[PDB]
Design a protein around this ligand. Structure first.
Ligand SMILES: CC(=O)N[C@H]1[C@@H](O[C@H]2[C@@H](O)[C@@H](CO)O[C@@H](O[C@H]3[C@H](O)[C@@H](CO)O[C@@H](O[C@H]4[C@@H](O)[C@@H](CO)O[C@@H](O[C@H]5[C@H](O)[C@@H](O)[C@@H](O)O[C@@H]5CO)[C@@H]4O)[C@@H]3NC(C)=O)[C@@H]2O[C@@H]2O[C@@H](C)[C@@H](O)[C@@H](O)[C@@H]2O)O[C@H](CO)[C@H](O)[C@@H]1O
Lengths: 114, 417
C-alpha cells in the first residue's frame, strides 16, 4: 500500500545526497526493488535496481556514481548519489519491479550552482 | 478545462506531446520489438522464460520429494492384484533409481495405492519433462522443437497383467513391437516387449519378468506443450490422491505429516497448480505479440502532418502488444511470488525450504535421477527463483518502455474513438 521516499533537496554540482524509501512488507518482501526518476519534460526513467539477495544494477547514466542498497530487516531502500550533475535534477521514486500500480509522492532532487 | 489538468499532471502534457509525434511513436514501437525479443527470444535474461522454467521445475520437484513414499500397485484395470510387482525405471525411489509398485489386495484409489494406470500416465509426463529439462528448454517463440524420450518398466509375479497385450497393444510378449501415433503435432510411439526368465544369466533379481520399452519421437518441447505435461503430472497426483508414508531421515529436515494422502498437501499442490495456470496464461500472450508486429514505421500520409485523431489505426495493435508484454511480465512475477520462501508461512514454508528447494544428488545436470534424488526436489528451484529475480532486475528499462508504449497507444485509441 505504501511507498514513501525522502531525502531530496537542493544541492550543488559535485554534491551528494542519500535518498530513503520506506516500503510496506507486501511490496518489499522477496521482491526486486528499484529507483526511478522523472525529470522536467520527460517521462519516468528507470535508474537502479536491487534483488532480495542484494545484487544491484544501474542505468548507464548513473553507473559508477549512485549506489543502491536495501535493508531487509526494516523494509528500507536507499540510494546514495554522488558526483551529482544538473542532469540528475528530477523527482525520484521507488517501487518494486515489476511496478506496483500506485506510486508514492516522490522526493525532489535539484542540482544547481550558487 | 485542460490547462488546469496539465498543471497538476505535467507527465500528461509530455505524453500528449509524444503521441502527436511520429518520431516518438516509432521509437516506442522499436522498443516494443526489442523488449519482445528479450521476452520470447531469450532464455537467461527473459523473466518469462525463467517463470515457465520455475513452474515446470516445481511440479517435477514435488514428485521428486514424495514419489518414493507413495503406495502403488494392483493390476491393469485399476483392480487389486494378488501378487504383482511392477517397477518403473528412471524414477526417484528409495535409495534407488526405480519406483516399485507392489501393494497387493488393497483396492487402488483414494487414500490407497495409486493404480498402475495413473502411475503410467504420471511416469510418462515425468520422463518427458525430465528429458526436456535435461536438454534445456527453448525460448518461448520456439514452437516446433521436439525431443525423443525412452523409458522402461517391468512386470513380475503370478497374475500380473500390466505388461499384457491388452495393457500395451503388443502382440507377442517376447520380441514384439507396436507403433501408434497421436497429438498440432504427430507423436510416434514404439512399444516393445521382452521376457527374461528367472534363470537367465545376468538376472540378479531372482525372478521372471516382462520388460516394456517405450520410445517416443517427435515429442513437442514447446513451453505450452511442457506445461501441459506438468499439469498432467500434478493433476494425476491430486486426483488419484494416494496414500503415502515417509522415511523421516533421522538427522536434518522433518516431513509434516509422515503418513497420509498425497492431496493433503493442499497448499503445495494449489500453489503448483496456480503456477502452471499462470505460466500457461503467460505463454498465451506470445501469439498476441506475434499477431501485432510493431516493425512498420507510421507517419501521416501524402507528406501531410500526422493527425492523431485520424491516422492512428495502428494504435489498437500497439496497445494490444504492449499490454500483452506487461501481462507477461506481471504473470512471470506472480509465478515467482507463489513459491518464493520469503513470503511463505509454516508447513508450506518448511516444505519448500527443507525439501523442494534442495538437492541430495551428489551441480548434477537438470533431469538426472540418482539413488539419492528421493525426498529432495532436485529441480533447481532455488537457482531458478534467483534467476527470475536477476532477470526482472535487468528488465527495468524495458518495463518502463513498455508502459510508455502502452500509454502512447492508449492516448491514440482515445483520440481515434
Ligand atoms: C502371452 C500371454 O498371454 N501372457 C499373459 C499371461 O502370462 C503368463 C502366461 O504366459 C504363463 C503361461 O504358463 O506364463 C507366464 O510366464 C512364465 C514364463 O513364460 C516362464 C518361462 O520364462 O517362466 C515362468 O516363470 C517361472 C520360471 O522361471 C521358473 C523356472 O521353471 O521359475 C519360477 O520362479 C521360481 C524360481 O525358478 C526358483 O528358483 C524359486 O525361486 O521359486 C520360484 C517360484 O517358485 C518362475 O516364476 C513365468 N511365470 C511367471 C508367473 O512369471 C506368464 O506370466 C507373465 O509373464 C511373466 C514373464 C511375468 O512378467 C509375469 O509377471 C507375467 O504375468 O498371463 C498374464 C495374466 O496372468 C498376462 O495376461 C499375460 O499377458
Amino acid at each position: 500500500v505504501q511507498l514513501q521516499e525522502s531525502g531530496g533537496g537542493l544541492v550543488q554540482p559535485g554534491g551528494s545526497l542519500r535518498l530513503s524509501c520506506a516500503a510496506s512488507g507486501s511490496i518489499f518482501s522477496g521482491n526486486v526493488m528499484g529507483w526511478y526518476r522523472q525529470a522536467p519534460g520527460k517521462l519516468r526513467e528507470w535508474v537502479a535496481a536491487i534483488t532480495p539477495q542484494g545484487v544491484p544494477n544501474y542505468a548507464d547514466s548513473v553507473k559508477g556514481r549512485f549506489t543502491i542498497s536495501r535493508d531487509n530487516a526494516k523494509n528500507m531502500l536507499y540510494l546514495q548519489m554522488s558526483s551529482l550533475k544538473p542532469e540528475d535534477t528530477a523527482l525520484y521514486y521507488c517501487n518494486r519491479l515489476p511496478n506496483y500500480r500506485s506510486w508514492g509522492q516522490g522526493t525532489q532532487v535539484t542540482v544547481s550552482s550558487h | 478545462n485542460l490547462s488546469k489538468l496539465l498543471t497538476r499532471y505535467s507527465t500528461l502534457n509530455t505524453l500528449i506531446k509524444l503521441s502527436a509525434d511520429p518520431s516518438a511513436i516509432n521509437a516506442a514501437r522499436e522498443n516494443l520489438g526489442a523488449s519482445a525479443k528479450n521476452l520470447i527470444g531469450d532464455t537467461k535474461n527473459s523473466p518469462a522464460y525463467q517463470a515457465v522454467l520455475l513452474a515446470i521445475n516445481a511440479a517435477v520437484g514435488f514428485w521428486n520429494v514424495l514419489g518414493y513414499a507413495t503406495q502403488c500397485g494392483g493390476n491393469a484395470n485399476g483392480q487389486e492384484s494378488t501378487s504383482s510387482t511392477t517397477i518403473f525405471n528412471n524414477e526417484p525411489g528409495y535409495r534407488s533409481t526405480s519406483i516399485t509398485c507392489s501393494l497387493n489386495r488393497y483396492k487402488p484409489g483414494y487414500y490407497g495405492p495409486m493404480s498402475i494406470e495413473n502411475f503410467k500416465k504420471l511416469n510418462e509426463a515425468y520422463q518427458i519433462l525430465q528429458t526436456a529439462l535435461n536438454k534445456g528448454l527453448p525460448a518461448l517463440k520456439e514452437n516446433n522443437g521436439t525431443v525423443s524420450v525412452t523409458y522402461t518398466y517391468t512386470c513380475s509375479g503370478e497374475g500380473n497383467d500390466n505388461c499384457s497385450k491388452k495393457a500395451t497393444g503388443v502382440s507377442d510378449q517376447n520380441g514384439g513391437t507396436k507403433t501408434k501415433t497421436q497429438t498440432g503435432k504427430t507423436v510416434t510411439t514404439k512399444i516393445s516387449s521382452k521376457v527374461v526368465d528367472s534363470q537367465a544369466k545376468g538376472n540378479t533379481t531372482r525372478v521372471s519378468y516382462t520388460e516394456i520399452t517405450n520410445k517416443l519421437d517427435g515429442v513437442p518441447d514447446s513451453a505450452q506443450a511442457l506445461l501441459a505435461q506438468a499439469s498432467t503430472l500434478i493433476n494425476t497426483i491430486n486426483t488419484a490422491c494416494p496414500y503415502f508414508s515417509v522415511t523421516n531421515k533421522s538427522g536434518g529436515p522433518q516431513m509434516e505429516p509422515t503418513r497420509g494422502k498425497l492431496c493433503g498437501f493442499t497448499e503445495e499442490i494449489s500453489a503448483i497448480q496456480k503456477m502452471i495456470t499462470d505460466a500457461q496464461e503467460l505463454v498465451n500472450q506470445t501469439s498476441v505479440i506475434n499477431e501485432h508486429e510493431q516493425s512498420t514505421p507510421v507517419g501521416g500520409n501524402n507528406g501531410k502532418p500526422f493527425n492523431p485523431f485520424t491516422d492512428a489505426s495502428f494504435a489498437q495493435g500497439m496497445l494490444a502488444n504492449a499490454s500483452a508484454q506487461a501481462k507477461m511480465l506481471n504473470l512471470a512475477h506472480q509465478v515467482g511470488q507463489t513459491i518464493n520462501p520469503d513470503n511463505l508461512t509454516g508447513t508450506f514454508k518448511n516444505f519448500v525450504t527443507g525439501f523442494l528447494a534442495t538437492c541430495n544428488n551428489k551441480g548434477s545436470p537438470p533431469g538426472t535421477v540418482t539413488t539419492q534424488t528421493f525426498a529432495s526436489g532436485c529441480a533447481y528451484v532455488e537457482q531458478t527463483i534467483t534467476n527470475l529475480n536477476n532477470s526482472i532486475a535487468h528488465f527495468g528499462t524495458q518495463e518502463q518502455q513498455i508502459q510508455q508504449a502502452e500509454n502512447i497507444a492508449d492516448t491514440l485509441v482515445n483520440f481515434g474513438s
